[PDB]
């Protein structure tokens, strides 16, 4: 079939800037291309059809161009509503194929997370398992590594992380990592910490 | 003449309905392009 | 404009059939496409019908196990996917391919479809025990299937609340967490949750005294 | 004016022929639906 | 409007080709369908051409042995059926599928097609010998193929006449009967018949004296 | 393919009544359905297209409805011309399929048939075979059983029956059964009768 | 009246554009005949 | 209106791809066909695309080794022929099938395609040595591939000139001849030739004294 | 597929005459037929579409007819521009197929060719091969047989002929036959001639 390649997959930009993204097809698709915008927890919204013609309700700051193989979506002045994920789709021939996707991030200053730790509640320890959670709050950028350490060097690596979307207010992220373990393994050890490495930290902090 | 003005108003309405059906046919004729592309894709 | 069917839960190897009703003008000179999106993944096209012709075109990776039907008398579009697997868990949308534009203009709300061998069960809530503001929250663990709505003080507290996406544990259940950042200095906080599939609603307080 | 009345009579005749060809196209476009249904039925 | 070809008679395993001519306006933006009806049975669709496209769609039970063609230069539609069997004996019609209606408006007169191994032979007439009215008639037996036209007194008598449908004997020939109910009390009655395939016309009287 | 089921296959009604027949499809066919009417010795005549739109020359008393799977043909006031056979046909997708068929009968009073018997003519007995015919005339209803009896109990069952259409004048039927046998079998026996059982007969009559 | 003459001139222009699109549709509808003949030829 | 690509030379068993650019109005509601003509032979149809549909129909003798593509963004039609053989050497045209007429109205200039295992080499010219007018000429032998343009006195002499078609020798090269008929009685004659593929131009005189 | 048969393949006629050619199809093609005209060294030119409708720039003297299977192209008065090759093509169904082709020749009087012979040049004899050429100039008709004879009876038959198109001025032909041989074979023999047989010649001429 036809392959749609969106470059880049992610982009970091500030409000007011102009941004340019591409969507290359594996073969000639003429003007058949449709750009979309999807918000977290929402269905995609049509923005540009026939690669140029803007759709209803789409503001004039958006921009489409390209024909055949190389295409381009661009914005003149970024606004908080513009920050979302965009997917291109070809309509030249079946089967229709989408692009990879381009997530737009709000660029902001570097922030250091307020790291916390919560021991497993008593009520959970009566059911046969325990779960330790480490919190990373209001940081930037998104790339970070949280290291679990049972007693001191266990360096377990048997947890599950979860990061929210970029906050609408301060453009900061938050991470939730859950250290699931058995009751006997929890009762066997005494020290439990959370090692976090971040760019905003001169040295990795620890909460034990 | 009111008879001429009324006849013009009737012609304007017929052309408006004719123009709407042409745009519909153009859209409906675009389906026939997709329908043949779907048959060729599913078969070949 | 585009109304779909409710959420469904199936086991692997089994099938499902999702409906999507459109207007009569849609079933005349328009087309309906089915696009899915896995949690965190991108949009993936599956198939489409041209209802006035009865023709259909499916995707290569789904060829043989996907079937899309549509009856014009009720103006409803059905999508049947066979040989379900765990990776098929995704949000399935129905969009109206508009031929004059060469694109899809109207979309549906989406349907939560989960392909897992687990049973519908209620979650288990446990308190997360806390001149610097403290951090307090709750833990939503061991429920199936998605989703869980989290509210604090019956929805009275919203500043500093962070409800994180739910992870899929190795046991097959979902685990979700939500926290809040309040000053040190009195008022109580009760995390309220409601699991629609299990039809269970529980409210848990937090009173850790150090 | 007789020139205006004659022009109106000429426009009325053109719209009558235009309306007849649209109804024919609508019928002929229904064939394309049957023709694709026949190809899909005979092949699949 | 729709003129077909004359009646035909074939042997099993052999084929036939029936024509049906339409107008030039029919071969432009219309379709022709071939429908057969066995004696006493219901209507059964066979196939159809969309002449401006050359496409054709046949029935499942006839798939492989039916072939329908049409030449626009003469505006004639041909239907060819191969591998003939005894059950294929039926009246074959050609109708004009009208796309705006989604139905067939004009029809043909129908063609008598018989699939049998018998030969064209003349019938044999024998008299049926009769304050209550009596019953008199004749017997039309041992002819092939259909039909036989029966008339009394060269068509002068019609009250109380009952010409029954012809049965298919085990020998492969047809047998038909026709009777009349006249009072007891003088005038003669002659049953007149004419078999068009054998080109034979015979007239037989009835004078049973008790 | 698509299966069209007409219920009932036959119907008995009088002139002036209202009648309702159905034609169910195996799957959704939208309004694509065409109703027809066929007379004995005639080609079918189009009555209703698109399930509702009456055709040219069709009187207003006819009626079509239904969409998708269940459909309905109905008449407000029956008339002698309305009594015939009706076949539905779908046009949703190929191959096109008709329905079973619904024959409309003229309901009338119960009548007893005037049964007769005719021995084989002499001229036929010279050719090697003989054929005995039994006549059933002007009866109602149509269901009846004629029993051949060579000599007395032979109860042969080696005949062929033939019934005309319902008479246009008195709405009565007539049956013709031919008892074909060999010359030797005919010359071997002496008694030949025709036993007929009918609802209008308190007891089965016999003509020997 | 100049308003009537101007309205007639506007209707004449709309009918000229309508007549051109019908002839185009007739040609474009002839493609759909070829396109189905090409699918039937390449497949069968 | 129809511009094609330049001449090409391939070896047997190999392939080629010839382009033909048309207008935007051609790629909308028109069709392009590819027709070839061997030297001296007749016109032979190969295939055609209906660009707005993507459909294509090829010839039976070329089925499996011919491929025709077209991109509407550049309004260019490409023709790819695989498994080349010596008989495939022909002039390939692209014509615009006009559906309203049912014919091809505009044509291209044609492309010289040669399927041979020879290499591009320059020719070798040798003089043809002559009240009756005499005959004089030159010999163009041992060049590959076609064509060769012949001119006399840099194009100053044209009366009585006969440039014959080139034959294909068993060695795989082409041989061409051109002569002239001038009176007996002084002026010199120089045959001028230029082989575009080899980019060679030579001029040879003739001075046979008897 | 559909087969188009053009009869005759060649035709000889004079300026001003009327000519009639046919193009039979293997099956019914309605009016779908297109006639073309090609000149030597030129692309074909459309003349008649839909079998009757003349095309742009086509003079009125041309003529098309026929429908279904038998078709006919005819000219009322021939002119020098009309003499060329014509190919019919069907458009009823794919694959499209052309006809055989009908070449139109200018009929003229019988002419005898001026036959010549040229020995191989010296410069060629130094490269290892030799080529003898025989010229036939300004003759009519086209059918002729040139016989090579090394020494006297070798009757080799190892040459290649080449004939130009019919001259625009006098409607005459010209032939070029090249006798390719080895240097040793050329140096082995002494006599070399060219035997030509033509209708305009009472006896075959020889140039040695």
């Amino acid at each position: 079939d036809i392959q749609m390649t969106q470059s880049p997959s992610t982009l970091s930009a500030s409000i007011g800037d102009r941004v340019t993204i591409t969507c290359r097809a594996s073969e000639g698709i003429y003007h058949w291309l449709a750009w979309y915008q999807q918000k977290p927890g929402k269905a995609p919204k049509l923005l540009i059809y026939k690669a140029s013609s803007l759709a209803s309700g789409a503001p004039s700051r958006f921009s489409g161009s390209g024909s055949g193989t190389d295409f381009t979506l661009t914005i003149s002045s970024l606004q908080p509503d513009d920050f979302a994920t965009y997917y291109c789709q070809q309509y030249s021939n079946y089967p229709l194929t989408f692009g990879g996707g381009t997530k737009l991030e709000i660029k902001r200053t570097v922030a250091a997370p307020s790291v916390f730790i919560f021991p497993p509640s008593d009520e959970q320890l009566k059911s046969g398992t325990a779960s330790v959670v480490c919190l990373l709050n209001n940081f930037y950028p998104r790339e970070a590594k949280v290291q679990w350490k049972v007693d001191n060097a266990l360096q377990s690596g048997n947890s599950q992380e979860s990061v929210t979307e970029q906050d609408s207010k301060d453009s900061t992220y938050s991470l939730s990592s859950t250290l699931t373990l058995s009751k006997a393994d929890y009762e066997k050890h005494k020290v439990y910490a959370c090692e976090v490495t971040h760019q905003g930290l001169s040295s990795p902090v620890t909460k034990s | 003449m009111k008879q001429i003005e009324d006849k013009i108003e009737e012609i304007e309405s017929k052309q408006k309905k004719i123009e709407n059906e042409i745009a519909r046919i153009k859209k409906l004729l675009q389906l026939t392009v997709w329908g043949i592309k779907q048959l060729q894709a599913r078969i070949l | 404009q585009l109304v779909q069917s409710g959420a469904e839960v199936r086991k692997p190897g089994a099938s499902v059939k999702v409906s999507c009703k459109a207007s009569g003008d849609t079933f005349s000179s328009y087309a309906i496409s089915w696009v899915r999106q896995a949690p965190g993944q991108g949009l993936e096209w599956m198939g489409s019908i041209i209802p006035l012709f009865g023709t259909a075109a499916y995707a290569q990776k789904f060829q043989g196990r996907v079937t899309i039907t549509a009856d014009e008398s009720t103006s409803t579009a059905y999508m049947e996917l066979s040989s379900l697997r765990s990776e098929d868990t995704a949000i399935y949308y129905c969009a109206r391919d508009n031929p004059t534009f060469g694109a899809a203009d109207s979309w549906g709300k989406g349907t939560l479809v989960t392909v897992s061998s687990a049973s519908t069960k209620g979650p288990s809530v446990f308190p997360l025990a806390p001149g610097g503001t403290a951090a307090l929250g709750c833990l939503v663990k061991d429920y199936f299937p998605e989703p869980v709505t989290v509210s604090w003080n019956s929805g009275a507290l919203t500043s500093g609340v962070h409800t994180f996406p739910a992870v899929l544990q190795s046991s097959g259940l979902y685990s979700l967490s939500s926290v809040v950042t309040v000053p040190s200095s009195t008022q109580t906080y009760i995390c309220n949750v409601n699991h629609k599939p299990s039809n269970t609603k529980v409210d848990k307080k937090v009173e850790p005294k150090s």
Side-chain angles (χ1 to χ4, degrees), chain A residues 83-102 104-107 109-116 118-122 124 126-144 147-148 150-151 153 155-160:
Chain A
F83 294 92
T85 319
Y86 300 85
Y87 298 88
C88 55
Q89 180 189 5
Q90 57 89 14
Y91 281 77
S92 180
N93 278 87
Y94 289 85
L96 310 178
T97 56
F98 288 87
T102 300
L104 191 57
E105 192 214 32
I106 311 178
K107 182 185 303 178
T109 62
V110 176
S114 299
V115 52
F116 293 89
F118 301 105
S121 70
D122 281 336
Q124 181 189 6
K126 329 298 195 66
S127 54
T129 52
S131 299
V132 188
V133 189
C134 183
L135 172 60
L136 297 75
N137 211 24
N138 291 12
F139 52 92
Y140 193 85
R142 161 167 152 81
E143 296 79 14
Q147 184 65 57
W148 286 105
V150 183
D151 267 325
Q155 286 198 7
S156 303
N158 45 18
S159 50
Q160 290 173 131

Side-chain angles (χ1 to χ4, degrees), chain A residues 3-5 7 21-23 25-29 31-33 35 51 64-73:
Chain A
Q3 319 299 330
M4 311 306 298
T5 61
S7 298
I21 62 178
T22 66
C23 163
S26 61
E27 41 187 328
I29 62 179
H31 64 273
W32 291 95
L33 188 72
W35 294 83
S65 177
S67 180
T69 294
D70 294 330
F71 298 83
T72 293
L73 175 71

Side-chain angles (χ1 to χ4, degrees), chain C residues 132-135 137-140 142-143 145-155:
Chain C
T133 59
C138 296
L139 175 59
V140 181
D142 309 332
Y143 75 91
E146 296 275 33
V148 165
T149 298
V150 181
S151 57
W152 285 93
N153 297 331
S154 303

